[PDB]
């Protein structure tokens, strides 16, 4: 039995934050405890949204409830989008304390910054969260999934090539996490300009061996919300099943991603009128219908070892 | 695609309310939209619990959000434990508006009253709720799943035998719902004292004005332990199986109750193993083994037969 504490947004309709992470982890066999950092009607890709936010004091009370009952034993912690630095600082305190009674606990973190759509009713992540991610979060995180933009902010460097990316990833390793994945970048894939390139690095174990990989997936003709949340949740699951093989973990995670996205776009175009661009409501991830692909994804991508 | 609006409690750890209802419906293939009426660390069966509650205004804000985006189209609405009358009344306004939008919408309601353990940090359900359930909720509900106590309160009549239970179910049908399932009762089952007896009734009105009523009885062997969230899990699976078997309450209930049996057997086996020999499992150890029961929820092997009355 593996127990995950996931602290992310909750939307009534659709998939983002905890909605995008819970179902996948459950069908894969993980026990998921979900703290909903906010509760909104839907994500920010729609024209309207309403809801309420949970403050750091409220998050503390919920955790204390678990502590008072002596049920605060976790194997994993999972976090993502946050637009509140005080909330984030509270998350760090909770993780450190959890790692105290279980030094084997793995903290998976997606350090979201910028203007990514989300389920917390925000248009942007405050610039002041950067120092908190750099100095408090990353140092205690074991697996991080920054996109290029985020990897550059965290290291103060700019990536202009594949070589600089590996250097940036090494710096991230020195900051703390043994597994780093740059989920997307603007690096032109040598396979074509329509493929999105992803890079992965894993320090295993006197000399620590580093396993580096690169992957490429063809872009999809649409804008989706919650894909970063789904990606991190499935990577958690597969790295747990393949602890020393980042290659297989990523191939399964990226393949699953492909199956869900393809089914989603196909359904969206079928529900929209002819020659009409699908709306955000029509583009919600087809989560429930992709159950089998999530459980056992047909491999459609091959990672090359660098 | 069948879309369900489920308005129930949320707990960080464990299974009760929306936590007990969501996963099962999703694995059965339903699109579940979940409004969390509260958010607590765990259910009220533990010695401690902390959390926040939503008032009726906050429920209205969330629904207005769906309405403003024109995505307030549902096939089902599902509610359970509710501790405040204002919230319950708001739920009724929502159901009525959605039924205007879709006349085929089915409202599944578990009218929890009394002192049932919950995820809403309540010790008891206020009496001021009974009037609302009788006059506002039940009349717009299509499927209701009260226990014996709740059926008696709703109709104002006590049940002393199987026959009276059927009369009470007929009274509930007259109040509104075409499908009524009394989930548990204090009635002595033919099979033996170690069996739990549940009764179901589905009323269908024919074109010529005649009425056909399917009445069934089900007996499940008891499990010696106190579980929480079983009523929520029951209502959610009943919703899925009646959808697949719209005119066959017998098959819908056999599948639902059978799935319950598989989930509870796996749960009690794991609880006893964790507590050790001679020690009674604690509420933390008795949390439903939801995730591990995926296959049994998806296609439960039939272990109980409904007797047609």
From Swiss-Prot, chain A:
Active-site residues, Swiss-Prot/TrEMBL: 229
Record PTM Phosphoserine, positions in chain: 56, 161, 207, 279
GO biological process terms held by the UniProt record: pyridoxal 5'-phosphate salvage
Any single GO CC term annotated in Swiss-Prot or TrEMBL for this entry: cytosol
Protein's UniProt keywords contain Nucleotide-binding: yes
InterPro entries: PM/HMP-P_kinase-1, PyrdxlKinase, Ribokinase-like
CDD domains attached to this UniProt entry: pyridoxal_pyridoxamine_kinase
Binding sites annotated in the UniProt record for ADP: 147, 183-184, 217-220, 227-228
GO molecular function, one term: ATP binding
Catalysis performed (reactions): pyridoxal + ATP = pyridoxal 5'-phosphate + ADP + H(+); pyridoxamine + ATP = pyridoxamine 5'-phosphate + ADP + H(+); pyridoxine + ATP = pyridoxine 5'-phosphate + ADP + H(+)
Ligand binding (K(+)): 110, 145, 183
Transmembrane segments: none
Enzyme class at the top of the EC tree: transferase
Cofactors that this protein relies on: Zn(2+); Mg(2+)
Family: Belongs to the pyridoxine kinase family.
Function summary: Catalyzes the phosphorylation of the dietary vitamin B6 vitamers pyridoxal (PL), pyridoxine (PN) and pyridoxamine (PM) to form pyridoxal 5'-phosphate (PLP), pyridoxine 5'-phosphate (PNP) and pyridoxamine 5'-phosphate (PMP), respectively. PLP is the active form of vitamin B6, and acts as a cofactor for over 140 different enzymatic reactions.
Protein name per its UniProtKB record: Pyridoxal kinase
Species of provenance: Ovis aries
Name of the gene encoding the protein in the UniProt record: PDXK
UniProtKB/Swiss-Prot annotation, chain B:
Ways its activity is controlled: Activated by K(+). Activity is increased in the presence of Na(+).
Name of the top EC class for this enzyme: transferase
Pathways per UniProt: Cofactor metabolism; pyridoxal 5'-phosphate salvage; pyridoxal 5'-phosphate from pyridoxal: step 1/1; Cofactor metabolism; pyridoxal 5'-phosphate salvage; pyridoxine 5'-phosphate from pyridoxine: step 1/1; Cofactor metabolism; pyridoxal 5'-phosphate salvage; pyridoxamine 5'-phosphate from pyridoxamine: step 1/1
Tissues/organs with expression: Ubiquitous.
Catalytic site: 232
GO terms for biological process, alphabetical: pyridoxal 5'-phosphate salvage
Complex and partners: Homodimer.
Name by which UniProt lists this protein: Pyridoxal kinase
Species in which this protein is naturally found: Ovis aries (Sheep)
């Amino acid at each position: 039995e593996c127990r995950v504490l996931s602290i992310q947004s909750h939307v009534v309709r659709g998939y983002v934050g905890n909605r995008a992470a819970t179902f996948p982890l459950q069908v894969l066999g993980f026990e998921v405890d979900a703290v909903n950092s906010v509760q909104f009607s839907n994500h920010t890709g729609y024209s309207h949204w309403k809801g309420q936010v949970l403050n750091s004091d409220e998050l503390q009370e919920l955790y204390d409830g678990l502590k008072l009952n002596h049920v605060n034993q976790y194997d994993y912690v999972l976090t993502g989008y946050t637009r509140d630095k005080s909330f984030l600082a509270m998350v760090v305190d909770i993780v450190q304390e959890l790692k105290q009674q279980n030094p084997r606990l793995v903290y998976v973190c997606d350090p979201v910054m910028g203007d990514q759509r989300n389920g917390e009713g925000a248009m942007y992540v405050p610039d002041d969260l950067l120092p908190v991610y750099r100095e408090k979060v990353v140092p205690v995180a074991d697996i991080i999934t920054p996109n290029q933009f985020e990897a550059e902010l965290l290291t103060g460097r700019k990536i202009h090539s594949q070589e600089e990316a590996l250097e940036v990833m090494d710096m991230l390793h020195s900051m703390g996490p043994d597994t780093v994945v740059i989920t997307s970048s603007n690096l032109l894939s040598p396979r074509g300009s329509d493929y999105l390139m992803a890079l992965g690095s894993q320090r295993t174990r006197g000399s620590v061996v580093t396993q580096r990989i690169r992957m490429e997936m063809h872009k999809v003709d649409a804008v989706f919300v919650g894909t970063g949340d789904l990606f991190a949740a499935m990577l958690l699951a597969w790295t747990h099943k393949h602890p020393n093989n980042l290659k297989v973990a990523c191939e399964k995670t990226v393949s699953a991603m492909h199956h869900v996205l393809q089914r989603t776009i196909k359904c969206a175009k079928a529900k929209s009128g002819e020659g009409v661009k699908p709306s955000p409501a029509q583009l919600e991830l087809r989560m429930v219908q992709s159950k089998k692909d999530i459980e056992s994804p047909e491999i459609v991508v091959q990672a090359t070892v660098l």
